[PDB]
Design a protein around this ligand. Sequence first.
Ligand SMILES: CCCCCCCCCCCCCCCCCC(=O)OC[C@H](COP(=O)(O)OCCN)OC(=O)CCCCCCCCCCCCCCCCC
Ligand SMILES: CCCCCCCCCCCC(=O)OC[C@H](COP(=O)(O)OCC[N+](C)(C)C)OC(=O)CCCCCCCCCCC
Ligand code: SF4
Ligand code: SF4
Ligand code: SF4
Lengths: 123, 59, 190, 318, 77, 225, 67, 108
Amino acid sequence: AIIATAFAETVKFSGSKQELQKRTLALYRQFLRGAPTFADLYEVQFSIPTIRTKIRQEFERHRFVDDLSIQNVLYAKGHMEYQECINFWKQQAQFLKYFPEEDDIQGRHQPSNFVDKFLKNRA
Amino acid sequence: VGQDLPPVGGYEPVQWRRNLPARGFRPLVYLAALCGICGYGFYRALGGIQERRELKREK
Amino acid sequence: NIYAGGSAAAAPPAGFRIHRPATWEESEEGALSKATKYFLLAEMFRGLYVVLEQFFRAPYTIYYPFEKGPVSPRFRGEHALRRYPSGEERCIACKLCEAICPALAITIDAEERIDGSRRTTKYDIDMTKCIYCGYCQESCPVDAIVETPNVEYATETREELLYNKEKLLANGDKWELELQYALDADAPYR
Amino acid sequence: MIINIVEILIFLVCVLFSVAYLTVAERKTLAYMQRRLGPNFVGYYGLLQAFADAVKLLLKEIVIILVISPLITLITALIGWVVIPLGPGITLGELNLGILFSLAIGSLGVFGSLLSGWSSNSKYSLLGSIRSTAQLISYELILTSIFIIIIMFVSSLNITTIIETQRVVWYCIPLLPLLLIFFIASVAETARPPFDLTESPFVFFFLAEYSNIILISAFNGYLLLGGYLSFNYSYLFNILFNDYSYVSFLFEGLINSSAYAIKLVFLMFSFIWVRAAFPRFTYDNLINFCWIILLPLLFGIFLIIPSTLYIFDSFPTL
Amino acid sequence: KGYSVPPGETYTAIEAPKGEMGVYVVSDGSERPYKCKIRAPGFAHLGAFDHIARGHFLPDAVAIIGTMDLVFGEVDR
Amino acid sequence: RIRAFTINFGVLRLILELSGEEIIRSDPHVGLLHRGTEKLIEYKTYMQALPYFDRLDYVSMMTNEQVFSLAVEKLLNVEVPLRGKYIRTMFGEITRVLNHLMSVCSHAMDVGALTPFLWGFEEREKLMEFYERVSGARLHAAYVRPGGVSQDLPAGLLDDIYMWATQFGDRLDEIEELLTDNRIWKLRTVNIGTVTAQDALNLGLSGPMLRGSGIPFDIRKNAPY
Amino acid sequence: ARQGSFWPVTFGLACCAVEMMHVSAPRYDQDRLGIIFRAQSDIMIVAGTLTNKMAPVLRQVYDQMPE
Amino acid sequence: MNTFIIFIILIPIVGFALLAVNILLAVYKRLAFNAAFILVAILFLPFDLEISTLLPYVMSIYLVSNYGFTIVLLFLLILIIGFVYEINTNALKINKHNKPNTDSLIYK
Ligand SMILES: CCCCCCCCCCCCCCCCCC(=O)OC[C@H](COP(=O)(O)OCCN)OC(=O)CCCCCCCCCCCCCCCCC
Ligand SMILES: CCCCCCCCCCCC(=O)OC[C@H](COP(=O)(O)OCC[N+](C)(C)C)OC(=O)CCCCCCCCCCC
Ligand code: SF4
Ligand code: SF4
Ligand code: SF4
């Protein structure tokens, strides 16, 4: 395989943290710009701002990561996920892995205190 | 004892080469036959055209 | 000799340089002779004649619901728990067929009675996941489970497809004489 | 009045039957080409296959134009049946310009291939419909050009005039290469698989396909091979019959339709026989075969015929 | 239990009719293999596709399939 | 700018980017039949890991059985007997006959020739009888164990293998006759899929495709077994 | 008509797809009643291991069938 | 009322009937191209249309003896040079980029 696929980039490992910060910056710009495509493409029920606030809160999850090479693998995994999402490779049931809390409320009795955990012995 | 064995003389040799016996005639022979059957056909056809013209004269 | 290094006695063979492909003028047949094959489709009619030869011979086809194809005695189909003559269950809860199964279909519960002999309270094969390797027939020392050569047992639910002890003892009941015949004919080669 | 409505009843009912028994004949003979039983049977009960799957074919799903193209494809395939004669002077409508009609309807038959690709459109499916259309017109050329070089010997657009001219010798035996290239242009009009890239409401395309199969078989049978002609049969009758009677006209119309049906049936069998033995074409190979190699031969045959009529007296009189 | 195998690693390759099929097994010394990978032959045949099938027609992308011989019990596995 | 449109050309998904008729780049998906058979054999003994190899590459199953039961034998330092060696040789070779009898007559169907697929199946049925009379089930014979070969031949089998080998030469020449000389067959396939001898190596190709390009290499004669 | 002709859109995806093609082979034809496995009808046949990746594809093929 | 005209009135009725039984019994519910595809149909017309210029000669071939012959021969011989124009120029052939251009490896 000589030529690559469409949105791919050669996986290459930066030696500094600021260059990685620039790359994750451009990456969030790519997700956020392609967010109107995903609602048309995967036929979701909901609004484009919920896609955008999810992309934001999935980069909130790894804001305080110190180690450089763990940021490096995290960037490579994020670019692979962008690559799958911007094409039609993922389907609409694996795109909705990302939104389990939105689609339906499962029922009563979400346990909060120790008693509600304990009546069904920590579920 | 009881297991299967080949015969003591061995089997006869099978045919594993290509069997393509030639069965077409020579191509110039088919072409000579084609030219012959064509030319005889044109003989009959143009003879029929001349006979049909003489009948048209009569009518 | 000594070879060059980077180099062995596996030279190119004598004649691996293949000749130049011959031109139009180093051809044995005439252009008219070649054009007779070109326009009159010489080898098209040959392959037409082959399929016409196949039209006039007697076909290979067989009726399924009234004839079954040729089978071996060592063939494997639905399971059966055998019995002894003079009526005895023959599975001694020895637990070998469960330990060998490459898909973990067997599930056996074993309990011992006052008599000192050993049997199974619950025998079970999941036939959604049995794979028909016949290792379970090969492992049992007392020849208590076999592969009957039946294949015509397709069901409509999965709960029918979970074979307990009773169904497999019924299968050992029905298929017995052909089962014993197949095992006796198989028995020299085992 | 009653005299002609019973006549068109008999003809429509016979052609409607024969096109339906072809759908059984193809399954049977391709079964025995590959040593299978195929369909169970072929008898009077034998239509109940082609009837039963013709019923069940109307039970699937489809996903104003979609109404019209199967309709015009089937009626274009069905109106061309008048102009074939089945015996001497037996036509369902007699017209002096029958080849011009037959040719105009081979021209009308292309439209369903265009309008079928519009329905349930994609980009790639639309391109595929374009390719089927262009091969259909490309071989329609050589179809029409050989119609010309057949009626060069007749110099008449009437069809019974062709066959009565053909009485002395069939046109197939002088012009044997023409028979070969017509047979391949005839499985080219249709999508028969040496020539079937572009395949590999549906009941109308299904019926009209086989109707075009047997109708271009008819178009072979009257102009290249003998139409209703087998032999002279002047001597056998003078021993059997004593005088013209309805039994005698029955017996002659019977043997004429037998001689026509044997041509049509052997040619129809050869379509299914050339189906099985060969793989299909690249479309570039299809267009290249039509234009660059076969059609210069067609201009050459077209120039060599009037010159041969010229060298001798031999011009045909109307 | 089964039989037990000496510790070591091997790559044994034979000629399947599809091509060179090898298997690379690593033995713990126990009776279960520690690791064992197949070299499916059609894996590199389908991996070689878009170096071979460039500039060909689209029905020229179908005859090229059947001689790289993809059965797909191989290529995914 | 060239704008190429994308289409979704066993189980296999394959992306094609087309500029008209030409393929400019191609991208085969794979994985829709990945079922994890490489990880499962780490939890099964070798006697139990044996059927995981006629599960994969199921058309030529005894050869796939054989490659595992050779890697194991080399790792065991044991030695299959002589009768075992000839027996596994000839079953691997009727397995080769079966695999080419499917592959040739399936390339012939994909190209379009419809008779050899049907003819090939009848011949194949005789071979599946040869498997059915040796192991229990057809199409999944576990018959070559790692220690050797599972059990002995039947009583009258070798005679029927000769009886098949007599007629098979003629019934192979028959299917050969209408494809080898055929112009449509030859036309559709003389310039398609060409592989240079240096790039037959860098792509990791082997078998009939490395031997297509001119390089004399096969493991039967180079490093025999 | 539905009885005497039966056209299963086959989902042959692994090992069992060839055994299904052994029905289409000259021995076990089922040419006579009228099952032909060569290929929008109202039956499909799942034959072989259904992976994680394919369960939406299987349901999507099952959805666009007549009722 | 002759026997020709019931047929071409009666067939659209047969098609309408086979269509109305279908409406009774059924279930309901730009890319760039190559120049060869357009050119086959555009260029098909001047070769379909000389054929109909050839149609009046073939009916009246007896009358124009020895003279309409040569006029038709010259007509066709003027058409053959435009035919050999398009077959000299490789007009219908569609090309692709599969060749590596076969340039020898040059060093230093
Ligand atoms: C008298 C002086 C002159 C002497 C010469 C005789 C000339 C008069 C004869 C004219 C009749 C011509 C018949 C049609 C010519 C076919 C041309 C041909 O077969 O080859 C060209 C073409 C490939 O073009 P090319 O690139 O040059 O390929 C080279 C491969 N050799 O090949 C192709 O693309 C396709 C080849 C197959 C064509 C389709 C096959 C249809 C199958 C029907 C076969 C006949 C079936 C008959 C059935 C009834 C038989 C009882
Ligand atoms: C290009 C050709 C050059 C070669 C010429 C050699 C022909 C032999 C001469 C015999 C003449 C003869 O005697 O036949 C005469 C016949 C007609 O006979 P009639 O009705 O009885 O004449 C009436 C008798 N009157 C006049 C006294 C009243 O006319 C022909 O149709 C013969 C043509 C032979 C076929 C040539 C076609 C060649 C194939 C061309 C397609 C590519
Ligand atoms: S045949 Fe195999 S899978 Fe089935 S119960 Fe026996 S050992 Fe287990
Ligand atoms: S069938 Fe055999 S292995 Fe299984 S419990 Fe009975 S004796 Fe033991
Ligand atoms: S059920 Fe699965 S494992 Fe068994 S033969 Fe079929 S595809 Fe292979």
